[PDB]
Design an enzyme around this catalytic site. Structure first.
Site, PDB file in Angstrom:
ATOM      1  N   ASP A 119     -12.247   5.776 -12.834  1.00 49.11           N
ATOM      2  CA  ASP A 119     -12.635   7.185 -12.808  1.00 49.11           C
ATOM      3  C   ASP A 119     -11.582   8.074 -13.477  1.00 49.11           C
ATOM      4  O   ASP A 119     -11.108   9.045 -12.890  1.00 49.11           O
ATOM      5  CB  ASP A 119     -12.955   7.631 -11.383  1.00 49.11           C
ATOM      6  CG  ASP A 119     -11.775   7.502 -10.445  1.00 49.11           C
ATOM      7  OD1 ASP A 119     -11.044   6.498 -10.543  1.00 49.11           O
ATOM      8  OD2 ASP A 119     -11.586   8.404  -9.598  1.00 49.11           O
ATOM      9  N   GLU A 169      -2.609  -7.717   3.738  1.00 50.04           N
ATOM     10  CA  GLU A 169      -4.053  -7.910   3.778  1.00 50.04           C
ATOM     11  C   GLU A 169      -4.434  -9.289   3.260  1.00 50.04           C
ATOM     12  O   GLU A 169      -3.667  -9.947   2.551  1.00 50.04           O
ATOM     13  CB  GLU A 169      -4.758  -6.827   2.964  1.00 50.04           C
ATOM     14  CG  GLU A 169      -4.512  -5.470   3.590  1.00 50.04           C
ATOM     15  CD  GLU A 169      -5.219  -4.325   2.894  1.00 50.04           C
ATOM     16  OE1 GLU A 169      -5.992  -4.567   1.945  1.00 50.04           O
ATOM     17  OE2 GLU A 169      -4.995  -3.169   3.308  1.00 50.04           O
ATOM     18  N   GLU A 218     -10.418  -1.796  -5.901  1.00 48.46           N
ATOM     19  CA  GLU A 218      -9.721  -0.929  -4.967  1.00 48.46           C
ATOM     20  C   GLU A 218      -8.320  -0.608  -5.469  1.00 48.46           C
ATOM     21  O   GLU A 218      -7.872   0.541  -5.398  1.00 48.46           O
ATOM     22  CB  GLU A 218      -9.682  -1.606  -3.602  1.00 48.46           C
ATOM     23  CG  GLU A 218      -9.103  -0.715  -2.528  1.00 48.46           C
ATOM     24  CD  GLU A 218      -9.316  -1.260  -1.128  1.00 48.46           C
ATOM     25  OE1 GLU A 218     -10.033  -2.272  -0.974  1.00 48.46           O
ATOM     26  OE2 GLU A 218      -8.764  -0.670  -0.175  1.00 48.46           O
ATOM     27  N   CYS A 227     -16.220  -0.682  -2.735  1.00 50.53           N
ATOM     28  CA  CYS A 227     -15.562  -1.806  -3.406  1.00 50.53           C
ATOM     29  C   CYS A 227     -16.531  -2.928  -3.776  1.00 50.53           C
ATOM     30  O   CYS A 227     -16.225  -3.722  -4.675  1.00 50.53           O
ATOM     31  CB  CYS A 227     -14.442  -2.335  -2.503  1.00 50.53           C
ATOM     32  SG  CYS A 227     -13.264  -1.048  -2.034  1.00 50.53           S
ATOM     33  N   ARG A 234       0.803  -1.222   0.000  1.00 53.20           N
ATOM     34  CA  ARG A 234       0.000   0.000   0.000  1.00 53.20           C
ATOM     35  C   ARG A 234       0.838   1.275   0.000  1.00 53.20           C
ATOM     36  O   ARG A 234       0.342   2.318  -0.436  1.00 53.20           O
ATOM     37  CB  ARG A 234      -0.955   0.015   1.199  1.00 53.20           C
ATOM     38  CG  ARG A 234      -2.134  -0.950   1.068  1.00 53.20           C
ATOM     39  CD  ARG A 234      -3.453  -0.269   1.467  1.00 53.20           C
ATOM     40  NE  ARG A 234      -4.559  -1.226   1.481  1.00 53.20           N
ATOM     41  CZ  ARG A 234      -5.795  -0.990   1.050  1.00 53.20           C
ATOM     42  NH1 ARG A 234      -6.160   0.186   0.563  1.00 53.20           N
ATOM     43  NH2 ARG A 234      -6.695  -1.968   1.098  1.00 53.20           N
ATOM     44  N   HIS A 247     -19.760   0.825   1.246  1.00 52.15           N
ATOM     45  CA  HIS A 247     -18.572   0.050   0.873  1.00 52.15           C
ATOM     46  C   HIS A 247     -18.493   0.072  -0.659  1.00 52.15           C
ATOM     47  O   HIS A 247     -19.082  -0.770  -1.342  1.00 52.15           O
ATOM     48  CB  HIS A 247     -18.617  -1.387   1.466  1.00 52.15           C
ATOM     49  CG  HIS A 247     -18.493  -1.428   2.961  1.00 52.15           C
ATOM     50  ND1 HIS A 247     -17.459  -0.822   3.646  1.00 52.15           N
ATOM     51  CD2 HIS A 247     -19.275  -2.009   3.903  1.00 52.15           C
ATOM     52  CE1 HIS A 247     -17.611  -1.025   4.943  1.00 52.15           C
ATOM     53  NE2 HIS A 247     -18.706  -1.744   5.126  1.00 52.15           N
TER      54      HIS A 247
END
Ligand SMILES: [Zn+2]
Ligand SMILES: [Zn+2]
Ligand SMILES: [Zn+2]
Lengths: 202, 142, 681
Positions: free
Chosen positions: C442, C374, C385, C655, C341, C653
């Site tokens: 996006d 994760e 995500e 995602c 991340r 949420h």
């Protein structure tokens, strides 16, 4: 006839243009007029029947480039001899075109053909201008005809012959070279299968 | 030596004469496994109209197992579309007799008899990476 | 007064006599005995205006209309035989006259013709040999827009009529109907007339197709064959594009919008898995509508492309297995990305580049993402995500790769970027992976970018979106009628801002500061300045970006099925927001049901929202204010109960598109809390 001659180099050379040959993949049926064997690197054809040859290049040669065909005997003991049309065919009325009765090779469909006798080696050769491939094509097809049977006495007399194709500039300088063996015979599909089988048996 | 990238012979018969040797005398390695070909495979390499591959001026051929393997993989990877021979003739504006088609399983060029068989049995020709393939008699019978 | 062929004057001989004898039957005998014969028609004339006058006079009588209809029904089935078995056009190139004569009939689109006469005529026409079609299309491309519209409409009504009149199902395919297939092939003939009749710019906008070199194995096989330099062969090209010499992508502006060629009723009935099969495998008895891409809407096309992507992913999986069986080597069937991340861009680059360099075929595997630290199974939510993070990081002005326009809210390549060509390649690959995995991003690029991706350079007219402040200024400069040299004092030199804000002077032409812009050279200057801003200023970066994108899409039918305007839709999603379709597909969890009072009140509120509130609601619930390809009905929104009535705002949420909605005690409270959540998020 000229009784002696120099030996032109037969080694394949693609040069700066990737010059290579191709042949229409033909069957071996009794009716085939012409047929090529990749295993023998050899063309089998009937007397004065069209033998199509494809020309392939990586990049287009310069303007005025030419394509020359010259014949030599494959057996080293005979490489100094000039391949000439056998006398019975040299005496035949079929030589009505623009090629000498002693020239074994003729080109079909192209009137810019020059039948040239080597001033220094006396060898018989056929020349045409190089022509780029047609729109949609990758290669240029030329049509050759052999005017004498390989079995002819007083001519080829069963001795194998090699056709050397040279890509040359407008002055005759070598831009590329390749070659293949020829057998002019009444039954190409049969003779081809025979020589191929003899090769496989070995 | 064949260390000149442009001026080394491409087809096995040419390499025979270039090395002053015959197909009965020459020994070659397969380009993937570098194993030695059986003489039966060497003949078939000549019959399949394939090109010698050169590394550092050394010639390499391809054995039967490797050729079939990589061809089958290439089929699974770059398959495009399948046409009838009749349709294919119209797309290329030439009779099937003249068009360059190789065996999809073993690269051997297809004879006009085999091409006819494709038309007779209403079988399609496959475009792979932009080159056309069919199945030769020795691969449609197995 | 029998005669073998007909002309305007010959017709007039009867107009007068029939009126004088108060009869029409002789003229009907004539017209029938004429128009039932293909030969009579082929021999009768090309005389377009004469035909137009004749029709304008004859179709004024109802009795004669039925005679034309009854003759045409007799004519066409014979013409089909001539074209199919006798190759008549190859004997007489005037045979095409027949079709020209019939098509000038204005009444072909009335229902009487649609039921039988026009279908039969379509069956005949759709058999014309390519050279004849090319002759006909070139003529139609000179017609007025309303006439193209009429011809389009004539076939559109037919396709619509037959789709509506016949019951199609998984056993009775639209692909098996000769009438619709024939009509579609006719309509294709009109479509290319519309293409060729538009504005076409072929000489100043082509970019080279850059292909990624295949893996060593395929290279060796290509070297073992005679193909060392033949790496460039193009996708499946349409025969008509070859015959006309003009591609769908070459037309900058058609006479009639391409969208009007989309037949929505057909799209609602067409089964794409079977069509794609017929597209891939030619069958003598079945047609494929993918060969007629103009008729398919973006949803239907995307579904075809998705079948292509999935069939390839599955092929790569088979290859993976075959390699493992023969050589024992264990390759991953998924494009498994593992990233941290805190280093998303670097980890993604190194990994995608090592993959692209070791094996460029791996980029065609199914994407699967794992964030280091994760734990979860990537069912698409982790990938989504990952895309959000990457896109946000790449567009941050601190990275300097892109400049953001406050006016249009669009991003454009920073000419002054020192960043390596790697990052541009990465964003290119990401876009490819997004299409390949059907995930909306996006991203906000002006139309020029999608044109450049397709291999067309951006032209002056494309500045209209990317640089309005510039496009307007150049348009003003072109419209000015005074001495440009004395009045504007501009030269072939322009100023560009460096990352440090310094104005860098760039010469559009050598020693451009000494070369003044004159009225004769201003159009050239605009072409050069446009070429500088759209190409030569970003070309270093853009070339890398485009390479990245093609590494994923090189073998895709994308270049054949879609256009720049449709690429945008695949990447970013659609701007049309159908909330009725969203209600129909929404799922409920935590004890809510479609019959719950709060849920009915929720839909009353959401339907009463403004388009801006609706965009905000989607942004809040889904992370994007746009709808996926196919509208909001494709978005599996889940309304999940987040406890009883409380003062809390709803939560989301993005995602997984889940809306966590409390069970509020009143419609007004639900409305006020929902409005506040979507406004303050
Ligand atoms: Zn003789
Ligand atoms: Zn091997
Ligand atoms: Zn085979």
């Amino acid at each position: 006839w000229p009784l002696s001659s120099s030996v032109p180099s037969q080694k394949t050379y693609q040069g700066s243009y990737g010059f290579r040959l191709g042949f229409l993949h033909s069957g071996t049926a009794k009716s085939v007029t012409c047929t090529y064997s990749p295993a023998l690197n050899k063309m089998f054809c009937q007397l004065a029947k069209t033998c199509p040859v494809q020309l392939w290049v990586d990049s287009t040669p310069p303007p005025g480039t030419r394509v020359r065909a010259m014949a030599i005997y494959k057996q080293s003991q005979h490489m100094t001899e000039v391949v000439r049309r056998c006398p019975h065919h040299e005496r035949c009325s079929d030589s009505d075109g623009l090629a000498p009765p002693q020239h074994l090779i003729r080109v079909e469909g192209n009137l810019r053909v020059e039948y040239l006798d080597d001033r220094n080696t006396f060898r018989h050769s056929v020349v045409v201008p190089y022509e780029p491939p047609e729109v949609g094509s990758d290669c240029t097809t030329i049509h050759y005809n052999y005017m004498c049977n390989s079995s002819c006495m007083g001519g080829m007399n069963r001795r194998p012959i090699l056709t050397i194709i040279t890509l040359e500039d407008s002055s005759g300088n070598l831009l590329g070279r390749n070659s293949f063996e020829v057998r002019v015979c009444a039954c190409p599909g049969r003779d081809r299968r025979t020589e191929e089988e003899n090769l496989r048996k070995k | 030596m064949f260390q000149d990238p442009q001026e080394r012979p491409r087809k096995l018969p040419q390499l025979c004469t270039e090395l002053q040797t015959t197909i009965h005398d020459i020994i070659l390695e397969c380009v993937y496994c570098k194993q030695q070909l059986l003489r039966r495979e060497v003949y078939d390499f000549a019959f399949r109209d394939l090109c010698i591959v050169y590394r550092d001026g050394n010639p390499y051929a391809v054995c039967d197992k490797c050729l079939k393997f990589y061809s089958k993989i290439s089929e699974y990877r770059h398959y495009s579309y399948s046409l009838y021979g009749t349709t294919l003739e119209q797309q290329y504006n030439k009779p099937l007799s003249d068009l360059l088609i190789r065996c999809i399983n073993c690269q051997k060029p297809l004879s006009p008899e085999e091409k006819q068989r494709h038309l007779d049995k209403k079988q399609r020709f496959h475009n792979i990476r932009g080159r056309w393939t069919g199945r030769c008699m020795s691969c449609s019978r197995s | 007064k029998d005669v073998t062929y007909l002309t305007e004057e010959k017709v007039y001989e009867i107009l007068e006599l029939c009126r004088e004898r108060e009869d029409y039957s002789p003229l009907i005998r004539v017209i029938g005995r004429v128009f039932s014969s293909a030969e009579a028609l082929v021999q009768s004339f090309v005389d377009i205006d004469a035909i137009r006058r004749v029709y304008t006079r004859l179709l004024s009588n109802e009795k004669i209309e039925t005679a034309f209809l009854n003759a045409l029904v007799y004519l066409s089935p014979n013409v089909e035989c001539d074209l199919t078995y006798h190759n008549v056009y190859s004997r007489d190139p005037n045979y095409l006259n027949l079709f020209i004569i019939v098509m000038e009939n204005r009444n072909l689109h009335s229902p009487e013709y649609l039921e039988m006469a026009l279908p039969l005529f379509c069956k005949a026409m759709s058999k014309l040999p390519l050279a004849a079609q090319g002759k006909l299309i070139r003529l139609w491309s000179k017609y007025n827009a309303d006439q193209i519209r009429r011809m389009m409409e004539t076939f559109q009504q037919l396709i619509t009529y037959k789709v509506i009149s016949n019951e199609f199902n998984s056993r009775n395919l639209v692909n098996d109907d000769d009438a619709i297939v024939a009509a579609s092939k006719c309509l294709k003939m009109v479509y290319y007339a519309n293409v060729v009749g538009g504005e076409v710019d072929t000489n100043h906008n082509e970019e080279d197709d850059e292909e990624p070199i295949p893996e060593s194995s395929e290279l060796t096989l290509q070297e073992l064959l005679g193909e060392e330099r033949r790496n460039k062969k193009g996708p499946r090209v349409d025969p008509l594009e070859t015959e006309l010499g003009v591609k769908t992508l070459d037309c900058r502006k058609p006479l009639i919008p391409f969208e009007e060629f989309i037949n929505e009723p057909l799209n609602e009935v067409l089964e794409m898995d079977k069509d794609y099969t017929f597209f891939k495998v030619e069958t003598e008895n079945k047609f494929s509508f993918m060969t007629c891409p103009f008729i398919l809407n973006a949803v239907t096309k995307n579904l075809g492309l998705y079948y292509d992507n999935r069939i390839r992913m599955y092929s790569e999986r088979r290859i993976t297995v075959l390699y493992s069986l023969v050589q024992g080597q264990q390759l991953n069937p998924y494009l498994r990305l593992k990233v941290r991340r805190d280093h998303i861009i670097d980890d993604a680059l190194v990994r995608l580049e090592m993959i692209a360099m070791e094996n460029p075929a791996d980029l065609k595997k199914q994407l699967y993402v794992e964030f280091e630290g994760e734990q979860g199974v990537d069912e698409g939510g982790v990938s989504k995500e990952f895309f959000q993070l990457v896109v946000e990081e790449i567009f941050n002005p601190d990275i300097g790769m892109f400049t953001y326009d406050e006016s249009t809210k669009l991003f454009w390549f920073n000419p002054s970027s020192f960043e390596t060509e790697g990052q541009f390649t990465l964003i290119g690959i990401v876009l490819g992976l997004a299409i390949y995995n059907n995930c909306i991003l996006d991203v906000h690029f002006p139309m020029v970018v999608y044109r450049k991706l397709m291999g067309k350079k951006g032209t002056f007219r494309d500045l209209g979106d990317s640089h309005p402040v510039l496009y307007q200024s150049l348009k003003d400069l072109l419209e000015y009628e005074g001495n440009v040299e004395d009045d504007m004092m501009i030269t072939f030199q322009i100023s560009q801002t460096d990352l440090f804000g310094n104005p860098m002077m760039y010469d559009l032409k050598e020693n451009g500061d000494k070369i003044p812009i004159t009225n004769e050279n201003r159009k050239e200057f605009v072409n050069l300045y446009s070429d500088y801003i759209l190409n030569k200023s970003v070309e270093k970066q853009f070339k890398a970006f485009r390479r990245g994108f093609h590494m994923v899409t090189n073998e895709s039918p994308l270049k054949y099925l879609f256009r720049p305007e449709e690429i945008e839709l695949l990447i970013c999603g659609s701007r049309n927001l159908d909330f009725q379709a969203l209600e129909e597909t929404t799922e409920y969890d935590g004890g809510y049901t479609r019959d719950s009072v709060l849920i009915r009140e929720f839909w009353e509120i959401v339907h009463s929202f403004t388009d801006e509130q609706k965009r905000l609601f989607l942004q809040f619930t889904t992370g994007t204010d746009r709808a996926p390809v196919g509208g909001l009905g494709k978005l599996k929104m889940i309304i999940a109960k987040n406890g009883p009535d409380t003062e809390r705002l709803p939560t989301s949420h993005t995602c997984f598109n889940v809306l966590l909605l409390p069970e509020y005690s009143s419609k007004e409270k639900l409305k006020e809390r929902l409005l506040k959540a979507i406004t303050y998020a």
